[PDB]
Design a protein around this ligand. Sequence first.
Ligand SMILES: Nc1ncnc2c1ncn2[C@@H]1O[C@H](COP(=O)(O)OP(=O)(O)OP(=O)(O)O)[C@@H](O)[C@H]1O
Ligand SMILES: [Mg+2]
Lengths: 43, 43, 103, 249
Amino acid sequence: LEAELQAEEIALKALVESESAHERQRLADADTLARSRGNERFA
Amino acid sequence: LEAELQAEEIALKALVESESAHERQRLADADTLARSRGNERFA
Amino acid sequence: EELMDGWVLMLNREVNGEFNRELYLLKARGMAHSNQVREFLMSDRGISLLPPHLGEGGALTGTARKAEEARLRRAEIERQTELGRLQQQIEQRRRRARAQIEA
Amino acid sequence: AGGGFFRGSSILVSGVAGAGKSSLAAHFAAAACARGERAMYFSFEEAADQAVRNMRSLGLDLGRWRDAGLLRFMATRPTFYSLEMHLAVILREVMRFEPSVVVLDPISAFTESGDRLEVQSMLLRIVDFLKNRGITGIFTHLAHGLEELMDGWVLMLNREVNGEFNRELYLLKARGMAHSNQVREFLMSDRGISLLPPHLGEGGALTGTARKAEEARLRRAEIERQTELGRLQQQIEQRRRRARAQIEA
Ligand SMILES: Nc1ncnc2c1ncn2[C@@H]1O[C@H](COP(=O)(O)OP(=O)(O)OP(=O)(O)O)[C@@H](O)[C@H]1O
Ligand SMILES: [Mg+2]
């Protein structure tokens, strides 16, 4: 049972890591898109 | 068994909360859309 | 056309095997006005404009409008039934936990 | 880049009727007057009092500048003069006042006043006279010759999508500078012409009500995914609590 619960802990970890990575990549992609459509380049 | 039923109660709670939030957000979205298509702005 | 202060364009187009009437204000100088292509009907009571169209798709007139209203109602009923069954299932689990506790 | 068009340039504003061509020209002239300079605005299809009233709803005050002797508003039908005398009057008047900005609204009103090559000759002479003096010329043209001689070109659109008409504008041409390549949507109001924030989405190219609908749809999808992740987290944690209870026993 202990080994099972340790495996579950590792699963929790991996899921949180994946969510954080997804948040990060969406912000990067949004910044890229807002760059390719912005008027910053002319200020 | 008690711990299981408490978990079930929490699940019921979360589901009802989600439904209420969904109702609310649909009303807000419907109001927004009916604004962007209405003749109120000219009364 | 250039010398006109207002301009009302009236349409009668074919969509879905029927002809639907519409009208919009192309030009109205000096004022604020709606930018909606509104659908209207003729009758013994004159020209009556129907309520504006509200839907995520939009731009449906005549019979297609009623069809989409019906479809939206059906989808809402479907979702409500889904939520109902889920609620009932979790509550049956709870009643179970009860019966076992009592025993 | 740099804050606008070059000074002595030739700018053509094009679009369909109701697009906003006259409003943009009036904004140009009103700004020119507001900086203390002088402007001349030649209208061939609207009267002076009517134009003032029409521009008043957009928040401009063309009357203030007329009463201050900084804006001369001249209105004459295309049939009042011959193509030669139209040019003569325009040049004489431009000479006397010594403007900084001259607007002709619209350039397309003279099409039936003569042959194509005659009206082109008149307009070319007007453009050359304006450019040899460093005067900025704003020409409004109705969409549907001398386009080639324009340094800037602003195309204004008013199109039908989703049972509504949405306004847009883009810079077709701006020689000598870097400029945006976006077809931006704008609105008119008591505050003038306001351009809405650019559109960011994987699909893109949505205007007006469809934009709000897609924003709502994106929010709904995000909420759905968040709820999915929540239920998964809760399920794995309930398994963990289980393993606990059994270990304790
Ligand atoms: N207070 C206002 N609020 C919102 N919109 C306005 C307001 N006043 C005017 N508008 C809009 O500004 C537009 C002005 O159009 P404008 O005359 O500038 O274009 P145009 O190309 O010069 O047309 P024309 O063929 O008459 O020369 C009106 O059609 C009207 O729809
Ligand atoms: Mg005009």
